[PDB]
Symmetry: none
Subunit: 110 residues, 2 copies
Amino acid sequence: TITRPIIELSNTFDKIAEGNLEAEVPHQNRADEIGILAKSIERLRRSLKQLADDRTLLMAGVSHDLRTPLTRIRLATEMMSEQDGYLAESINKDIEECNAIIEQFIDYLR
Amino acid sequence: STITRPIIELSNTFDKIAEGNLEAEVPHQNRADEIGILAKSIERLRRSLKQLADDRTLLMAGVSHDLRTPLTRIRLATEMMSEQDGYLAESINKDIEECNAIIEQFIDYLR
């Protein structure tokens, strides 16, 4: 009927849901309701692929962005007085720990 | 056709999910025909999207957990700084607030 295209779309939807985020969604250029459905499935695929890529790039992003304030904290410790030297060292060690924590985080997931 | 209704309804559901309504209800999954096959597939897509979203959130909560201790220790240290180093205590506290904000922003998809 329109049976075959629906089954092909469902099969593709399945393959995408299971991880093949680059699979081509068929029937997007059909003129009837199947084309409407196919375009909606393509929008789901694009959402999935966005969120997948985002999850993969997350840690690198977090590290990159946190670098700016963490570096400013370190620079502030560089400017602390002799009287406050012990606190400069303590804070700097806390920064080093923040850096280690960020760098090491992915090791736990692998 | 007699299946046009559910096909368009399922497309509208898929569009709502793709836009971010990850808890949408996917109708017609109980059916054994083409419509039910399709609906189940769309359900699988929704579940995959929701799982990725949940993974992201979980990871960011882990970042927050791990950073909380050292950032707290830095805040405590700033409370002990001399008056002459007030400017630096203030700057560091602003930087801690920015760490916290960056984390929040990632959770909220602003980064």
